Design a protein around this ligand. Sequence first.
Ligand SMILES: *[C@@H]1O[C@H](CO)[C@@H](O[C@@H]2O[C@H](CO)[C@@H](O)[C@H](O)[C@H]2NC(C)=O)[C@H](O)[C@H]1NC(C)=O
Ligand SMILES: *[C@@H]1O[C@H](CO)[C@@H](O[C@@H]2O[C@H](CO)[C@@H](O)[C@H](O)[C@H]2NC(C)=O)[C@H](O)[C@H]1NC(C)=O
Ligand SMILES: *[C@@H]1O[C@H](CO)[C@@H](O[C@@H]2O[C@H](CO)[C@@H](O)[C@H](O)[C@H]2NC(C)=O)[C@H](O)[C@H]1NC(C)=O
Ligand SMILES: *[C@@H]1O[C@H](CO)[C@@H](O[C@@H]2O[C@H](CO)[C@@H](O)[C@H](O)[C@H]2NC(C)=O)[C@H](O)[C@H]1NC(C)=O
Ligand SMILES: *[C@@H]1O[C@H](CO)[C@@H](O)[C@H](O)[C@H]1NC(C)=O
Ligand SMILES: *[C@@H]1O[C@H](CO)[C@@H](O)[C@H](O)[C@H]1NC(C)=O
Ligand SMILES: *[C@@H]1O[C@H](CO)[C@@H](O)[C@H](O)[C@H]1NC(C)=O
Ligand SMILES: *[C@@H]1O[C@H](CO)[C@@H](O)[C@H](O)[C@H]1NC(C)=O
Lengths: 112, 197, 50, 35, 287, 117
Amino acid sequence: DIVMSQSPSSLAVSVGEKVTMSCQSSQSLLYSNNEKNYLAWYQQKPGHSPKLLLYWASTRESGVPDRFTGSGSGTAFTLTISSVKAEDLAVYYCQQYYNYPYTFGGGTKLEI
Amino acid sequence: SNCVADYSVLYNSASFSTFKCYGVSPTKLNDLCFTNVYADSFVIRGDEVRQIAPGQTGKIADYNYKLPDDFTGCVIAWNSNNLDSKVGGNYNYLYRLFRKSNLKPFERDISTEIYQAGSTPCNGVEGFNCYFPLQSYGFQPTNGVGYQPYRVVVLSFELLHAPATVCGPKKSTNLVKNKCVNFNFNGLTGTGVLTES
Amino acid sequence: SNCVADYSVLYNSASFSTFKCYGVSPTKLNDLCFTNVYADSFVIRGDEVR
Amino acid sequence: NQVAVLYQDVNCTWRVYSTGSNVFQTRAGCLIGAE
Amino acid sequence: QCVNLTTRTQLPPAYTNSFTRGVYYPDKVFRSSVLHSTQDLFLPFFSNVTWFHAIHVSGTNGTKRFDNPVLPFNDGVYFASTEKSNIIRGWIFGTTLDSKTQSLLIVNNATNVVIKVCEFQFCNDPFLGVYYHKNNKSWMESEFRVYSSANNCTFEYVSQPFNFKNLREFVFKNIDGYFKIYSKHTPINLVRDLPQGFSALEPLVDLPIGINITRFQTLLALHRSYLTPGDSSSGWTAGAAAYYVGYLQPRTFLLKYNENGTITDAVDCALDPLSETKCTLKSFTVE
Amino acid sequence: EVQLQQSGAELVRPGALVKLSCKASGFNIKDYFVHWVKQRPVQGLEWIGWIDPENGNTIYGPKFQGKASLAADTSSNTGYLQLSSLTSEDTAVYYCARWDGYETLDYWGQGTSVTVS
Ligand SMILES: *[C@@H]1O[C@H](CO)[C@@H](O[C@@H]2O[C@H](CO)[C@@H](O)[C@H](O)[C@H]2NC(C)=O)[C@H](O)[C@H]1NC(C)=O
Ligand SMILES: *[C@@H]1O[C@H](CO)[C@@H](O[C@@H]2O[C@H](CO)[C@@H](O)[C@H](O)[C@H]2NC(C)=O)[C@H](O)[C@H]1NC(C)=O
Ligand SMILES: *[C@@H]1O[C@H](CO)[C@@H](O[C@@H]2O[C@H](CO)[C@@H](O)[C@H](O)[C@H]2NC(C)=O)[C@H](O)[C@H]1NC(C)=O
Ligand SMILES: *[C@@H]1O[C@H](CO)[C@@H](O[C@@H]2O[C@H](CO)[C@@H](O)[C@H](O)[C@H]2NC(C)=O)[C@H](O)[C@H]1NC(C)=O
Ligand SMILES: *[C@@H]1O[C@H](CO)[C@@H](O)[C@H](O)[C@H]1NC(C)=O
Ligand SMILES: *[C@@H]1O[C@H](CO)[C@@H](O)[C@H](O)[C@H]1NC(C)=O
Ligand SMILES: *[C@@H]1O[C@H](CO)[C@@H](O)[C@H](O)[C@H]1NC(C)=O
Ligand SMILES: *[C@@H]1O[C@H](CO)[C@@H](O)[C@H](O)[C@H]1NC(C)=O
C-alpha cells in the first residue's frame, strides 16, 4: 500500500509572507495510459468536515481566486502560497489516488 | 494494381537469364488483363535458380520458398554479381538450412528457434547436435557462375475470372451494339452481338 | 544397398547445378523405397552435361 | 421426407449407416426404416 | 498489462444444430436459374456447433462465467454471434499465440478495423477495455490490453469496419497461402438459437498472409464504470453476447441460384441417401 | 451546492453493532459512488471503501474488510454502513463520502462521532 509523508509539521509566518509545504511519496503517482497524476490536496479547519481541493494540480476552483498554488512530480508534491493571508488559517493533507487505500498524509499546519 | 503493364520499358536496361511463364503464353501477355497481381522478390544462389518452379525438391523449395502446383504466373531471374557481391564477402543474405517439415505453398517462416538434431534438447544454447537455423551466403566477385547471387522475381495472378485492374498496353475502342463483332473484354476474346441487359 | 537414403545431409556441403529425375518425382523421392540401386560417376565438359 | 434404406449385402438377424428401428430382413437385403 | 479475468479453466460446452448455415459464394461469376455443383470446404449441414455464452451469471453462482478459450483451427472455421452493443470485437489467429511465431491480429473498433500480422507475445485473457460513466451517461475510450510486445511486423491493413437483433456470420479459410474472409450481416429476432433459414455469405477480403494457422482465440470487449490505476480485473461485466463456432470439411454441394443471382437453397450431398440422390439427380424434388 | 445529512454523535456500549446513515439531496445515489470514512485525531483518518447502488455489490478496503458491511437502497437518498461488533478501534469519528467515477471524492457530510463508556 502507498504511504504518505508531509512537511513541515507546523510553520508560523506573517501575513503576506511566502510559504511552501512539501509532501513526499515512496512510489510513483504517474499512470502511463492517461499520463495523469492521481493526487489531490485538502485544506481543513478544526471541526469543519474536510473538503476537496481541485486535484490533478489544477487547484483552481470556485472560491477566492488562486487561493493556493500547487506543484507535483511523480514522487514529490508541493503546495505554495505567494502571500499568506490572515483569514486563511489552514491545515493541509496530501492524498493519493493510485491504489487502495487512498493514502492520507501526516498533515501540515500553518499558523499566523 | 491500377497500372498498365507495358514491359517494353525493360528492353533497354534489363537482361534476364531465365523467363518462364506458367499458365500463360509469353506472346499473349500484351493482350490480356491480370487480376490480383503480386510481386515476390528475393536473392538466391546460381544453382538454386532451378528450384523456383512447381514440384521441385531441395533446400530452397523445402524450407524457404514453395510454389503451388497450380500456379498461374511467370518467373524472372537475372545475374546480380555486379551489385550483390563485395570483395570481402556479402553476409547480408540469409537462408534457412534446418527445418522440421517442408513448407506449404506460398508460406513464410521467420522464426529463429534452435533446431534440435539429436535426441536431447539443448534449451537454445547452441551446444552439440543442435544448430542455428539460419546461415549466410558467401558471395564474392571471384566465385563461380553457380556461386554468384541471382535475383529472382516471381509474379502471381489469375486470368479471366475476376475484375482486373492492371491490363496491358492495348488501346480500347468504342462500343458498337446490335452488330456481329469480335470483342476483347478485359482479355476475354470472343464473337457475338452485344445488347443492353 | 542396406542404407537409408536421407539426402538432407547433402544440403550443407553440396550444390548441384542440374538435378533431373525420370520416372519419379523429386517430392516423392523421400517416401518411396528403391530396388537395385547403382551409382555411376564420371567427369565431362560443361557443354556435355546436356 | 421419411425414407427407407435397403442394404442388399448385409444380413440382419452391422455395416449400415444407422440402425434406428423397424429392421426387416429380406432375401433382397436388409430394409431399415420400414415396418 | 493484463490481470487474469477468470480462474475457472473450462465449463462443459453445449452444442446446438447449425441448420443449413454457412454457405458462401464459391466464385465471382453470376448465374441465374442454375443448379450448380461445387466442391469446397463447406460446413456440413445439421452439424454440431459449440455454443458459447459470455453473459453475467446470477449472483448466487460464482461471479464470473464468461469464456474465451483458445480453440482449434481445423481446415477453416465458421463463426457467428448474436449480440447487441458490439460486445464481440476482433479475433486472434496463430499457431502458438506467442512471440516466436507470427500470428494474425484482426481487431475492429466500431469506426475501424486493424489487421496486423506480427510476432506478438499475447496475454492469457486479451480484452478491449471500454469504460462508461454515470453522470454524463456516455460511453468512453477503450484500452487495447491484448499484447505485451510487437516485433518484426510484416503486414498492416486498415479498412472500413466490417432480446437480440444482430446476427453476424464469418467464414475463415486458409488455402494456398491466402486467408479469405466471407461475411454476412442479418437482423434477426430469435433470442437463443440459430435461425431456421438460408443466408449466403459474400467475399469480403482475401489476404496474402502466408502464415501457418493452427489455433484461434476470440476477442471480447468488457465494460467497467470505475477506473483506478492500481487495481484491475475487478468489476468487468460481459453484457449479453453469444458466439458459435463450427468446423469446415471437404464436401460437395449443389446450389440453387435465383433469377436475380442470389443463392436461395443448397443441398448437402452426404447427409443421407435421399440427399445423395438429390445431389446426383440435379433436382430439389425427388419423385 | 450539495449537502449531506449525517447521524449525530452517539454514545454506545461495546460488544454490539452500530449503524450509520448518510443522506443526499439534489441527485440520486445511483448517479454516483459512496465512500465511508472514520477519523481519529491520534492514529489519523482511515479509508474504508466504496459501494455501488447500481451494481448491487460493494468493494471494501482491507483494513476494514473484516467487521464491516455496506448496504444501499435507492428508494431513499441514503446509504448505510454497519460493523459486526464494536471494538476500541471502531470507537471513532465517522464520515461518508461520494466518489465520482474516474475521479476523486467530492462530498463529505458533517460527520458522526462514536464515543464509548
Ligand atoms: C503448422 O504448425 C503446426 C503446429 O505448430 C505444426 O504441427 C507440428 O509440427 C511439428 C513438426 O512437424 C510436430 O513435431 C508437431 O507434433 C506438430 N503438431 C503440434 C501440435 O505441434 C505444423 O507442422 C506446421 N505446418 C508446417 C507446414 O510447418
Ligand atoms: C570430403 O572429404 C574431405 C577430405 O578429403 C573433407 O575435408 C576434411 O575431411 C576430414 C576427414 O578426412 C575432416 O576431419 C575435416 O574436418 C574435413 N574438413 C573440411 C573443411 O572439409 C570434406 O569435409 C568432405 N566433405 C566434403 C563435402 O567435401
Ligand atoms: C441371413 O439371413 C437369414 C434370414 O432368414 C438367416 O436365416 C437363415 O436362413 C437360411 C435359409 O436361407 C437357413 O438355412 C438358416 O438356417 C437360417 N439361419 C438360422 C435359422 O440361424 C441367415 O442365418 C443369415 N445368414 C447369416 C447371418 O450368415
Ligand atoms: C525483430 O526486431 C528486433 C528488433 O529489436 C530484431 O532484433 C535485432 O536483431 C539485430 C540483428 O537482426 C541485432 O543486431 C539487434 O541487436 C537486435 N535488437 C535487439 C535484440 O533489441 C530482430 O532481429 C528482428 N527479427 C527479425 C528481423 O527476424
Ligand atoms: C495471472 O497473471 C499473472 C500476471 O503476471 C501471472 O503471473 C500468472 O501466471 C497468471 N495466472 C495464471 C496464468 O494462472
Ligand atoms: C452433438 O454431440 C453430442 C454429444 O457430444 C450429442 O449428444 C448431440 O446429439 C450432437 N448433436 C447433433 C448430432 O446434432
Ligand atoms: C482507428 O481509429 C482510432 C481513433 O478512432 C485510431 O486511434 C486508430 O489508429 C485507427 N486505426 C487505424 C487507422 O488503423
Ligand atoms: C464527463 O464526465 C467527466 C467526469 O470526470 C466530466 O469531467 C466531464 O465534464 C463530463 N463531460 C460532459 C460533456 O458532461
